[PDB]
Amino acid sequence: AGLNTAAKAKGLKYFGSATDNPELTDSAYVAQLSNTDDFGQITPGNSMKWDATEPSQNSFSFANGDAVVNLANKNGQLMRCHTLVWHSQLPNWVSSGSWTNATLLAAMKNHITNVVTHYKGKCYAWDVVNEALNEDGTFRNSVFYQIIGPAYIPIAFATAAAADPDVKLYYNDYSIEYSGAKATAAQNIVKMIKAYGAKIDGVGLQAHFIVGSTPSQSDLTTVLKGYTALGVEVAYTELDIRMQLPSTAAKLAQQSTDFQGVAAACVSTTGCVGVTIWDWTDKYSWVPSVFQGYGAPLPWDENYVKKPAYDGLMAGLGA
Ligand SMILES: *[C@@H]1O[C@H](CO)[C@@H](O[C@@H]2O[C@H](CO)[C@@H](O[C@@H]3O[C@H](CO[C@H]4O[C@H](CO)[C@@H](O)[C@H](O)[C@@H]4O)[C@@H](O)[C@H](O[C@H]4O[C@H](CO[C@H]5O[C@H](CO)[C@@H](O)[C@H](O)[C@@H]5O)[C@@H](O)[C@H](O)[C@@H]4O[C@H]4O[C@H](CO)[C@@H](O)[C@H](O)[C@@H]4O)[C@@H]3O)[C@H](O)[C@H]2NC(C)=O)[C@H](O)[C@H]1NC(C)=O
Ligand SMILES: O[C@@H]1[C@@H](O)[C@H](O[C@@H]2CO[C@H](O)[C@H](O)[C@H]2O)OC[C@H]1O
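YS: structure for the whole thing
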């Protein structure tokens, strides 16, 4: 009957979508977000990030994150909670601080404990650390890495596990979905967290792909199995497939094939628990303001009408 029904029929836990608070006043938008045939899971696109939840040190703000949890709870949708430790969307007090290892570690641990305790029992998964890697697989030189060193990653996981032992703890990144230096380094993050004795349950593969430059079904499936071989689960967490504008029938058809391969790779991999698209309508896509000349990246257009990619997804889910 839809993407989520189709996904569950192949043993996925969900097919879902990100959203953001400003969109929840658009009633036609919210009615389709709340369509559990298509969406069995929601991610808050911004309201659980550090600048939203701890805008001043030790001053926590949960109203906007809680609004998304309440919508998911009313609908019967799962939550993915996103994201605890990330170099982007930090409030000023983190980025401008004069820190020692001790004081930044205490601030990072306090952030994690407070936010994970608030959301205890509400999240299927947390994106505990986001985007810790450079494209060459070396560690991204964020304030956390500069001041604390590599330990910040396992300490973040251990701190989340102490506050909520049940939630799945994910490492989330982009350009780790196909073989290369970064994917190898993401495997090594899994191994490093376990060598420290800390818990990691999942690898989140963002899947911000490009129409006509999407990895093949077989390349995606090799990489999914590469992570599940390590004793973690996997999910595609932020799937969108951006096209060089302007849109044409040919580009929409290529986009459908590209989406179909992503869904089919996850269905073909035991331990791929689901797919989340990074919102569902081109109207609200983050892409056009970030990627010059690119857009129309989602399975519904800016009028909430299905594009061919909706059918490509359904085919990849074996509907
Ligand atoms: C801020 O404060 C915090 C809190 O006090 C400081 O946290 C400490 O951070 C240490 C890392 O900086 C961290 O050490 C690691 O511990 C884990 C766990 O070790 C325990 O368990 C294992 C397994 O049972 C056991 O073998 C150990 O004896 C311990 O009981 C280890 O897995 C880590 O081991 C890796 O790193 C070391 C050190 O690597 C550096 O130095 C070497 C040689 O000098 C150099 O070659 C290397 O390139 C690095 O510069 C290696 O000797 C090991 O072989 C391991 O290396 C593998 O893994 C790395 C990734 O983790 C790869 O990058 C590497 O290529 C290789 O594949 C390591 O010992 C402490 O546990 C942690 N303490 C606490 C209480 O949390 C933090 O340092 C501090 N920050 C600053 C800037 O001051
Ligand atoms: O509204 C946008 C968000 O959609 C965007 O989401 C980011 C994209 O970059 C990373 O992939 C990250 O994991 C996501 O949270 O963040 C910027 C914001 O303006």
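YS: worth flagging: Residues 249-267 form the longest helix (19 residues).
IM: good catch. Also Residues 101, 105, 148-151, 155, 192, 195-196 surround ligand 1 (CB under 6 Å).
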